[PDB]
Amino acid sequence: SEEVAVKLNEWYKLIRAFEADQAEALKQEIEYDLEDMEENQDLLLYFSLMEFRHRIMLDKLMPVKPFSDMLNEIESNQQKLTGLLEYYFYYFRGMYEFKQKNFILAIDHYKHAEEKLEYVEDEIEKAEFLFKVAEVYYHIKQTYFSMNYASQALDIYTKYELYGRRRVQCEFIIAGNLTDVYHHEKALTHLCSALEHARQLEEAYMIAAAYYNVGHCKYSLGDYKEAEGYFKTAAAIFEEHNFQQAVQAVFSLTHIYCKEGKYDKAVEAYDRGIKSAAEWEDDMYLTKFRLIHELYLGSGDLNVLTECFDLLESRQLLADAEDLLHDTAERFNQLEHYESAAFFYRRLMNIKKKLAEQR
């Protein structure tokens, strides 16, 4: 009854602390305790929700090259959900939609979960929710709300002296937002602090992410030479530990080689990137690689570029589409292909409008 219900909450704590081995051991213990008890739909729905959250953690730590199944099972009994479980329902599904790059849907789930945030018992657990909200807001370039949520989260971690993965991630988001408003120096200060904090965590994923973000910031600043090494370092760490983030890292590396006119290195990075993206079945980065290749290493065929942007927009990756459109428009402008430049400037306008109306 309450005892196993306590175990489920103790399981939740291990999950949020990224304690994979301890979470697995406690899950199996709960499973045995559930099969040796009477019919309890309240705890069965509790377990199903927590099992879903558990798989999200495992996939994040150890990604591979049945979420939908678990999702539909939970949704089949959502009329029974109330209070705490209803909060988990919207929160966990919001987390899953973020993974699937369905940002608008993720936010809608988060906002519904936020209405029942009273069922969170401690500020540290609350801080995780605030980060996740700030995280998805950053991916739709909602800078204002993202900064607000990330700052609240960061203050909680600072207050309780909890220097874990979540705090470093809060620093990433704050820096990312600052870069979006071109406050690069402030952003770099945060990223430098986040990098050393990531090293203290001794987690390869976070160290590599920290290196990418510094490169990302310097790239935005225009320091292309410096950004090279950061992208290269991040790509190496991500590949060595078999993370899918290695794809994005190589893409940014390829893109910057193209911008610098380092076509030989761009070609090598391109081949490396499309091969990696193919292994991860990452169709969107394959499209992105196809785009920049056409723009820099190819003929610059407008039909190919249009199709690539059509694909990005159809997947609702508007922030990335905005960046690549700006890059495409400016590229044709620098090459004095004014008709093509004007064409992509207008599509850039359209995307900026869609970005603004979604907020």
Binding site: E135, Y138, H139, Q169, F172, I173, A175, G176, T179, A209, Y212, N213, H216, C217, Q245, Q248, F251, S252, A319, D320, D323
Partner: peptide
Amino acid sequence: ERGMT
């Protein structure tokens, strides 16, 4: 591109 977390 978006920064990583």
